[PDB]
Ligand binder design. Structure first.
Ligand code: HEB
Length: 396
């Protein structure tokens, strides 16, 4: 019953040496407070994400872990939701649900999002007053860009932001019932939005393409589109994107050489998203459940037991990324990071987010190449969704 040096918040601002300590001896071990087997190496994490033996059907288990002794009946909104979205379903249902939303994520769509995001990022960074000298990059940039991308790339109506953001914030973090009510709000909003009963959806956006494709859907139901749209809203306004932006900004702030590498060579620019994502996973760990007994890292994981796959540790496994603690844009294989997961449930917005990141650093660094930290960066108290709460920055 030895507690794990994970679980405890003290490691959040810099969890990587701890990950290393543990990975040396105990790459797979029990975490008392997560009710789960933590797995830490790249090999076993990738294996975990690809394995048809671990199920994504994990709502009951994760909810147990997060709200002990507070079970929910199968017809409760949380369970219907989990049963009807890509995140918590296995093939073949998962594949049908995934195919039902591909209209927003085609090659052509991303061709458009590229231009849109170039624009948005440039306007954001250009909006910084010419004599600024100091900034907290978290509220000013990292928290702001995903919102603007949500409006102009995804198609969330601007006027509806004030409805959606507090509700996702509540969901992501008081009471389980309040969270359930907010999730219900997200479903009802998705439903009414598609019927034109809410804000105006800008054209050529994700939600516009999704809406136009509803009449052509044959394997899935309107209800399932509502569920998945609720999921989309949650991921859209989660701290994951701002966390990536801010952690990357901090990485550049502490690595001038990579700033000049960035400004000189287009290769570095094109690898920037992947290297930032590798250096700090916004989602430090994701969850699985063993459908059957699995043998991993020298451990017999029993059927029904929960697994915590530490993508953040895998991104800095020296077995896969030589000198993993270095922020390096010339790195050959940054694209092998697990920050977007891997295989079946690989992040639906991976390319959109990569575009957002790239253009953000292009715009930031073509105006402020002389960025430094001006005081200690402050991290949130959570490891699972790890992100900077404050990043004080001197621009000039
Ligand atoms: C659209 C909206 C959206 C956005 C914005 C996002 C953004 C993001 N994302 Fe995401 N995702 C998503 C949507 C999303 N997403 C979905 C829907 C999913 C599921 C898929 C499947 O399942 O198939 C994911 C998934 C996912 C995963 C996997 C998990 C598992 O497997 O379990 C990960 C790791 C991630 C991450 C992420 C990050 C880090 C970010 C920032 C940077 N993602």
């Amino acid at each position: 019953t030895v507690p794990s040096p994970l679980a405890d918040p003290s490691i959040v601002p810099d969890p990587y040496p701890v990950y290393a300590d543990l990975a040396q001896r105990r790459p797979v071990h029990w975490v008392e407070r997560l009710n789960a087997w933590a797995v830490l190496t790249y090999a076993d994490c990738a294996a975990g994400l690809k394995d048809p033996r671990l199920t994504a059907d994990r709502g009951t288990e994760v909810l147990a872990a997060k709200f002990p002794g507070q079970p929910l009946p199968p017809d409760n909104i949380f369970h219907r939701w989990t049963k009807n979205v890509v995140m918590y379903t296995d093939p073949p249902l998962h594949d049908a649900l995934r195919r039902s939303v591909r209209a927003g994520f085609t090659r052509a769509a991303h061709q458009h999002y590229d231009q849109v995001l170039q624009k948005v990022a440039h306007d954001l960074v250009a909006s910084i007053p010419a004599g600024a000298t100091e900034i907290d990059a978290v509220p000013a940039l990292a928290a702001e860009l995903p919102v603007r991308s949500a409006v102009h790339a995804f198609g969330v109506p601007e006027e509806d932001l004030g409805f959606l953001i507090p509700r996702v914030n509540t969901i992501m973090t008081v009471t389980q019932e309040i969270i359930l009510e907010k999730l219900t709000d997200l479903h009802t909003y998705a439903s009414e939005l598609l019927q034109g009963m809410r804000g105006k959806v800008l054209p050529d956006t994700v939600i516009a393409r999704l809406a136009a494709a509803q009449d052509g859907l044959t394997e899935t139901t309107p209800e399932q589109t509502v569920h998945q749209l609720a999921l989309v809203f949650i991921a859209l306004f989660a701290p994951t994107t701002p966390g990536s932006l801010s952690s990357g900004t901090l990485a550049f702030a502490r690595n001038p050489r990579q700033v000049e590498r960035f400004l000189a060579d287009q290769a570095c620019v094109d690898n920037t998203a992947n290297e930032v994502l590798r250096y700090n996973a916004s989602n430090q760990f994701t969850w699985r459940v063993a459908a059957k007994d699995v043998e991993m890292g020298g451990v017999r994981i029993e059927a029904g037991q929960t697994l915590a796959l530490f993508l953040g540790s895998a991104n800095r496994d020296a077995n896969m990324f030589e000198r993993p603690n270095d922020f390096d844009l010339d790195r050959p294989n940054s694209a092998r990071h697990l920050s977007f997961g891997q295989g079946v449930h690989a992040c639906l917005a991976a390319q959109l987010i990569s575009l957002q990141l790239k253009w953000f650093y292009v715009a930031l660094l073509n105006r402020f190449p002389g960025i430094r930290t001006a005081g200690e960066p402050i991290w949130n108290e959570n490891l699972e969704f790890r992100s900077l709460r404050s990043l004080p920055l001197s621009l000039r």
